[model samples]
Target: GPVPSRARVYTDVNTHRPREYWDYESHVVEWGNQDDYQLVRKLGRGKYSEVFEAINITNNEKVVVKILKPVKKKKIKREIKILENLRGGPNIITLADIVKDPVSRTPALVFEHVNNTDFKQLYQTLTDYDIRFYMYEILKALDYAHSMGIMHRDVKPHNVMIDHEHRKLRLIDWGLAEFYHPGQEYNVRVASRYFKGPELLVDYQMYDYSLDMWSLGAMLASMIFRKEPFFHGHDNYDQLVRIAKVLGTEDLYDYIDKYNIELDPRFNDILGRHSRKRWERFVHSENQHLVSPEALDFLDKLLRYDHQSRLTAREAMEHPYFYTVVK
Candidate 1:
């Protein structure tokens, strides 16, 4: 409502496409036979689906089965159709087949498995420069999606499945993904709004692919700063203000003004006048090895408050930080 603005990059992606192109509800899915696979064990349970590590009886290998948890078909269609549309993109997760239970009529998304690298354990043995490599790999994934007119709402470290032995990284978890239609006001309650800036909390709805950049920013800050989340918010309301405490309270208002944002109305309490901290403050002895000059510069560009100020995925991959790695 502020200026009737759009994203700085890829402003009208969904505009050129046919109505049915971004439309998923009209698409009927072809469910395959689910009897061939046996569930080995439960891998994890997410908000939308139950994940299991399964084995294909005939071929005899590992795969992941994500059984949808009785939700709206619209959501189910969103995940399946978006994944279907994003096919052949670099580092986008490979979807094997779609199947469902005959009796229960439950939907199950089948996928080829990668060695799931737990980021908690990943950062420990990982060398300092290795962060550059993986971030670049994920940037490749983001760029391809943006080019296809999509914004992956759920982008966290867990969503990025890495396989060093196989020599490729996969950006998995498209269940919360959406095709970017410029000027659309999106819901604030999204998948893991952890790695964030001010938009989600302030309820700024017109965010673009640049929203994913905040996810990368927080992920990298944790790696180098040695904090789990660069901005640790206690609750949904508290999280945005947590961002304010770090980025400073004053600049938060600048973003709120620039975007003409409104909030939960209960948010004014945490506005306890904060001063901005320099990026230099995080450069310390323990993290100094990973905190190269170019690394900090690249991070500052992404961690900014305004969505338009953040680097596009295309611009990020070309940054000097990624050039440091020999391999």
Candidate 2:
């Protein structure tokens, strides 16, 4: 329940936005008829919902159906509102419609079908420049969302759908995303274990858009370094330990003290002193082509222990790492 004492880059970014923009409770969802859509195949599942590939019977077009599990009405509304708000943003997943089962009253969201390749396989075949290109594309999505006063709390490879053949990337899974309100305390229980930022682990609820940048950094690290999870923590507690090992425990302590955040009592036993590891330590013969001075510099800026110090999506897009692709 600690408030952030350090200043963040986008502290006032959402201050001028209309209340209705962030107020999900006041908006009414105009639900579509579920009879129009038919299930085709199962896509995947998340903690909050089940995803399936479905078809619109009327148009004969493939679509993604995300069925919401039983959850608080407000949480569901938040996801719908955020998705609706960001419908046409660059590289953002398009929400085609909202539907529900009349008898069960279970809600489902319909999205445009993307011919995506699993990132685990897709990343392996990418050229060094390909990694830069996709990361730049994702930054476009992040910058666009942040500009709209929304922060994608969950940003992991699983949520990024890449149609490698066409070189398309769509930032999906806004279930954990929320409107960014300056100085507001948000729940730290968002994002996946490996992709969670320092603020979430330290229970600093006053985090902002920078949290997504850290997740982006982690995702980029995995692709460039050839480490499946860049920060393969066993659990929530060890997640922070894994991060500290790379960024250094001293810097983590500095971040904690700067925000006046109280360390979870459980961390006392596991947390220990550690020095920062060089980014080059990850480079090897297999991944050397993907690793470069610019890439290391960009990752260092992103994977900072202090969320406030991490690169903004806009700033990250300008980093030298993407010069070759951008030009």
Candidate 3:
């Protein structure tokens, strides 16, 4: 197949705007061919794909365009299958279209272009109490996804977007997600390192939906205090030290050792340690007043050290935190 020139792909007018602006209407006007969509600008680039805001000519509405870079076709196929299986849920982002990018020679998945900031960015603008309300929505989404048998391995703020314009919330970025049997743990080193749970870092063999809960807890802390939830070390060792500093005294180590847990050994150095100031600081943080009783109570359950004790999304919606909408 011959490579299509950028000009042949879309008219010169499109070059002026950013890729994020490209959506349904742009494809018809700028791309004379009309067979393929026109990209507005780049949204983000991940390990396997580059996301763009593109237009869906058929519907004339804005949508997200995720182009999977050339790699093992098997991975791309797996992702498509996952999306197909997990489609039609309310909390999940809806898949709108699919296409093959002629230039990159990659597969692309188009979705609804949610015109809102992610929960992380949204936190910066909202009050701490507002943050709690916002997180209630996230919990509902996660709970809904869980009931569908999908575990969103990555549940950080970056993966959560807010539709303030429509007074709604939605989850995005399922590249690292997977489907799992309700109680089985298909251990794997998945998800962003910072948002990773201690169990996953030390024992990959012991995995489950709780991993997402840990991330949600970390995100809750970040939203309340307007800070980063976990460490950003170059390696696992550095990250352990960071975690130790925050969690205080290798309580995590004790939990692992007492349970005869098998760890990756890479996490050994920073185990069984303690840090007092972190807990004290958190308890006395200025944002303490920002949290409501219901929000705080729900957070405790989600952030529990025991994975099994962590509140499932369905259970969380029933908590007092979500009473207003729990009918």
Candidate 4:
């Protein structure tokens, strides 16, 4: 299939920006003193970094200390540059400082602390209105980042910190994010398996901001449907199949054909044609309260197989699903 030349939204966002604004290689990182912060405890870890709940000893304030593993220097610089560029954006995590271990030279990023509850536990307690509210909060971050020509390639429940008590939602983890250039192909290995958009599984690298919308939809689906992972694929190949089961295999083929994407031969036998499953089919006694026509419509727009057809974050925020919540 032939991929679209650019995203339907933000097609010209980075066009006028200076090369340096999008070029992390040209920017020099100003390393801060590691001694200024003290790690309190390990919060979490990812393939790229280890996160700690820490304290800024000088200010006596809590902060998140993200210690990078031994990875490419370019990757580290890119994350720092993007964070710096998006510092004041709504709901985007603020990078307080960047430091390196004196002995290992391993880079670490200091960020504002968010008192977040685990999504697995939190989602269960959220009312229908709560889902719409937080999703709207996430859209603010997405729209802001996209407007700045940045694509958060990794958008998932874990990356979204919800301080539900205060009604705060923050988008974090910019490691996989990159400056979007029209018509440029990106690494397919960006987002997590369950949340990976159809474009990613099909190896469509020219995807842009719409990628994040697909992930947001997946997250919303789990919340509304009360499923841990809306698309539970055993492996990467099976991931596409799981999505195909809901969105239909025919639509998947049409998407690939539209983009001129070539499917891996391994998909031949496994990819049997399937009709699109109704979103209402997911409703049960447990999740009926969260189901609504507007909710289904909003999810449908975001979970489209065609990347270009997915709603922009700004557009999604304007959907009827958010009418009552946003006000």
Candidate 2, residues 91-118, lDDT tens digits: the string is 9999999999564478899999899988
C-alpha local distance difference test of each model: 0.82, 0.89, 0.64, 0.91
Query: Which runs of model 3 end up more than 4 angstroms from their true locations?
Result: 1-36, 118-121, 182-187, 230-234, 246-250, 264-268, 275-280, 283-285, 324-327
Best by TM-score: 4
Per-residue lDDT of candidate 4, residues 207-324 (tens digit): 8898999999999999999998999999889999999999998899889998889998899999898999999889999999999999999999999998888899999988999998
RMSD in angstroms, all models?
Answer: 1.7, 1.6, 12.7, 1.2
Order candidates by TM-score, high to low: 4, 2, 1, 3
- What tens digits encode model 1's per-residue C-alpha lDDT throughout 74-103? 888888888888877889987777888564
> How many pairs of residues collide in each model?
0, 0, 14, 6
Q: Pick the candidate with the highest lDDT.
A: 4
Model 1 clash pairs are: none
In candidate 3, what are the lDDT values of residues 1-327, reduced to their tens digit?
111111111123323535423221222211123255778889899887898887766667877888887764455655565565557766678876677677876667877878887555666677654665677777766766665455688877778777876756778887776554433455556777777776666654445566788888877766665566535656655665666666655566555655576555655564556653433255445666656666667766766545666776667667786665423
TM-score of the candidate numbered 4?
A: 0.97
Report the poorest 10 consecutive residues by lDDT, candidate 4.
Answer: 1-10
